[PDB]
Design an enzyme around this catalytic site. Sequence first.
Site, PDB file in Angstrom:
ATOM      1  CD  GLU A 239       3.518  -2.656   3.948  1.00  0.00           C
ATOM      2  OE1 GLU A 239       4.169  -3.732   4.020  1.00  0.00           O
ATOM      3  OE2 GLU A 239       2.876  -2.329   2.941  1.00  0.00           O
TER       4      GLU A 239
ATOM      5  CD  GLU B 299       3.080   0.198  -0.113  1.00  0.00           C
ATOM      6  OE1 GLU B 299       2.942  -1.023  -0.343  1.00  0.00           O
ATOM      7  OE2 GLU B 299       4.059   0.648   0.532  1.00  0.00           O
TER       8      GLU B 299
END
Length: 585
Positions: A159, A235
């Site tokens: 991320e 995710e």
Amino acid sequence: QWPTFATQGTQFVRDGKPYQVLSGAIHFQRIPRTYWKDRLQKARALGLNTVETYVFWNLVEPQQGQFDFNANNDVAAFVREAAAQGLNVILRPGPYACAEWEAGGYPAWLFGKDNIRIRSRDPRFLAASQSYLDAVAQQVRPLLNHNGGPIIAVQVENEYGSYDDDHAYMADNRAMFVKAGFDKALLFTSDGADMLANGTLPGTLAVVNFAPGEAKSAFDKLIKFQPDQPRMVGEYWAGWFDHWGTPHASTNAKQQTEELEWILRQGHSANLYMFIGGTSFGFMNGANFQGNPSDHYAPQTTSYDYDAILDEAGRPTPKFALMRDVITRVTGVQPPALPAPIAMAALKDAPLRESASLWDNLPAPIAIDTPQPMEHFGQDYGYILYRTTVTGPRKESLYLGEVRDVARVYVDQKPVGSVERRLQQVATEVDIPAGQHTLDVLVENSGRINYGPRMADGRAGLVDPVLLDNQQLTNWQAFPLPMRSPDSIRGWTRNTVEGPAFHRGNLRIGTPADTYLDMRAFGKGIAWANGVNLGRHWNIGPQRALYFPAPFQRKGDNTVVVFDLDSTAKPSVRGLQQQVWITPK
């Protein structure tokens, strides 16, 4: 040889055949090694075909240049167990993991005196990254898919798009993964759906991470950004984590179950985060400090229960049957049975009749002109005491600045206040009698921030000038208190002691069995059971007991030692068959 894994247009292929990845997150450093097989068999019982895990750098290189992949750090043995249970593996070595974990996974020693800027192109940080990546790759090299093994994909960074958009930094990381040899598996990045332009690299697959209710929106953005590649949610946050002082999470299982079915019916691949969260044992929790003006330092709990499919203790929740049935409908394949359930046991109340004052357990003093953060003394986790001498009579404000993270202040070992950056506190009034007196400022590292623009300043303890009213206090002593073994504690007595103090007794166990160690007698601190640091306890909640799994226990007497900052009126512990949740104070 494990089947080959690749992409082909808008699908993944496994041995050249269309394949939908059905993955769940299990952090092998958050699950007792003895129980890795159990959690992996439960993932198969859900209908999953893949497990995904981070590697936490700060556990496998606890001192620079000194790697450890033994025991609960043995990533190769975890991966071999997954293969043995018929699961592909997605490996995410970081180096930044995030993961609601201390410093996002970065070793404490990166925040020392060399003034290294983490997560950047600081050459010291890049070289440290490469050394770590090389070490992990050596552990798992034959297990990588192009070498014939079960590791089908490897994530580069984590991320990054939510942090910055220095594409040279991301390119550097991909090149380090290639140099280490991770290009013997499919490489990919993951990002939030609005962060893809920031965090990705042309030529490298991107996947998307998102919350319940965002699936249609987030996949529309991923497909627009990357129209000719497979679609995966790296995710899916099927649960959420806790902070000390806020209610235990309760998320919507119906929403998550219906949206999971929608995702899988598109053909998209998915990784459920978390399938089981487990526990951040010892000092290894993380903390938040978000970017809005009303946001402040917020430490996470010891439990990583996460309101996940499996609870902290590996027990299926109602969400397990719900999502299992989804996957059974979509695949048409009946999953294998659950293993025999692992029991919970209750244990009778056990008084801890011995006490030892923290003041009788200090190391040799280290002379400093003004307080310095704990990494200046080679310390990673725990507590640090700063001592100096003051003269009264004065009733004045003691300024500590931005404390990392909780300070208890004393005058001649009597408490005179506390200062938590969680509560926007930077000072406390102190009453100093006539004459000379000892000022003690005891600081707890409550967990380095693991996400966001403030995480690069990972210094713990004190860093600011200390002032009494308008006068700076100089000439101090520092005492690092990492609390690495309870066996070294001295000053033990059967008298009552004021906090801060340790408390000890025996807990008798006939046959080892999972239990929750009730911490309700205590104020705030940590606890050891049978020599294992189980983590933190705090009476503000929501968590009020500590998971004590059977493989950490021995037959017969088990020593329990509890550290409590506060004076403890009736120190004792008992074995519960369930977590204690309370509404925060």
